[PDB]
From a paper:
Flavin-binding fluorescent proteins (FbFPs), engineered from prokaryotic and eukaryotic light, oxygen, voltage (LOV) photoreceptors, are promising fluorescent reporter proteins. Their small size (about 10 kDa for monomeric FbFPs such as the improved LOV (iLOV) protein derived from Arabidopsis thaliana phototropin photoreceptors) and their oxygen-independent fluorescence make them ideal reporters to monitor transport and anaerobic biological processes. In contrast to GFP-like fluorescent reporter proteins, whose absorption and fluorescence maxima can be tuned by exchanging certain chromophore-constituting amino acids, the absorption and fluorescence of FbFPs and other flavoproteins depends on noncovalently bound flavins, whose structure cannot be influenced by mutation. Using spectroscopy, X-ray crystallography, and quantum mechanics molecular mechanics calculations, we provide a firm structural and functional understanding of spectral tuning in FbFPs.
To rule out that the I52T mutation alone is sufficient to generate the observed red-shift, we introduced the I52T mutation in parental CagFbFP (light red solid line). The resulting variant showed nearly identical spectral properties as parental CagFbFP (gray dashed line). The latter is corroborated by the X-ray structure of CagFbFP-I52T, which is virtually identical to parental CagFbFP (C-α atom RMSD 0.52 Å, 102 aligned residues).
Residue numbers in the entry:
A (entry chain A): 48 to 153
B (entry chain B): 48 to 152
The structure:
Amino acid sequence: ASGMTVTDAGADQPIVFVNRAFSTITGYAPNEVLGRNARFLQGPQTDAATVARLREAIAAARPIQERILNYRKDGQPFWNQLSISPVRDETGNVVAFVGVQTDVTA
Amino acid sequence: ASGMTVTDAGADQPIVFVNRAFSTITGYAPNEVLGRNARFLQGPQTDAATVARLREAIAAARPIQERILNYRKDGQPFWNQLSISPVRDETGNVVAFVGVQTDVT
Ligand SMILES: Cc1cc2nc3c(=O)[nH]c(=O)nc-3n(C[C@H](O)[C@H](O)[C@H](O)COP(=O)(O)O)c2cc1C
Ligand SMILES: Cc1cc2nc3c(=O)[nH]c(=O)nc-3n(C[C@H](O)[C@H](O)[C@H](O)COP(=O)(O)O)c2cc1C
């Protein structure tokens, strides 16, 4: 089952919702992630260039797919097949971002 | 500001998240809508053919936009410019639906 994260569009994209699978994958409870930028999932072995591509895509409200090394709450590394897309109204205003997170470590 | 509604993909698409604007537009608090299908927003004068188009789009996980007559908690009618899109993982599985609700009254 794939994780889903919803963030606000503006002001450093704080998490506003995660599904159950997000907790299964990351080991974080909703309480522990709400109001935070998802970048806490990253650590020392996370690829800087991949993070840069995410940063620029989100700034431009551009859909992006990346395979990124993330870390469970307990510090265990896992490979995150991450898909982020802006949510737009019909006037093109960005209302939110949605992230789909799949553990592809195996 | 535009409302946003997130539902589960399966089992009659219960609401799992709404943003602030959803409450401003509909007059419903999150606690009142969570776990419910969004069809409660429809009323007597809602166009049946529009509802049928939404029903078929969701069944096939197809993106759809409709202008649909909805009703606030207090019963006042409003025109809802509604856009629904499936949220998919990289293997095409539908993880959720996202609806954007703009009051165009
Ligand atoms: C909806 C959403 C979900 C995200 N999910 C993840 C994730 O699961 N793992 C991750 O490393 N980064 C994720 N990010 C990316 C970070 O929040 C951040 O945008 C990224 O690290 C680049 O920005 P920064 O250089 O300011 O940290 C997500 C971003 C958004 C908007
Ligand atoms: C994410 C999402 C948001 C929705 N938002 C609305 C809405 O704001 N107003 C509305 O009348 N129907 C909305 N619907 C549609 C109803 O939930 C339902 O799909 C529609 O009435 C057709 O199915 P039915 O014939 O089983 O009711 C939404 C559906 C989804 C999946």
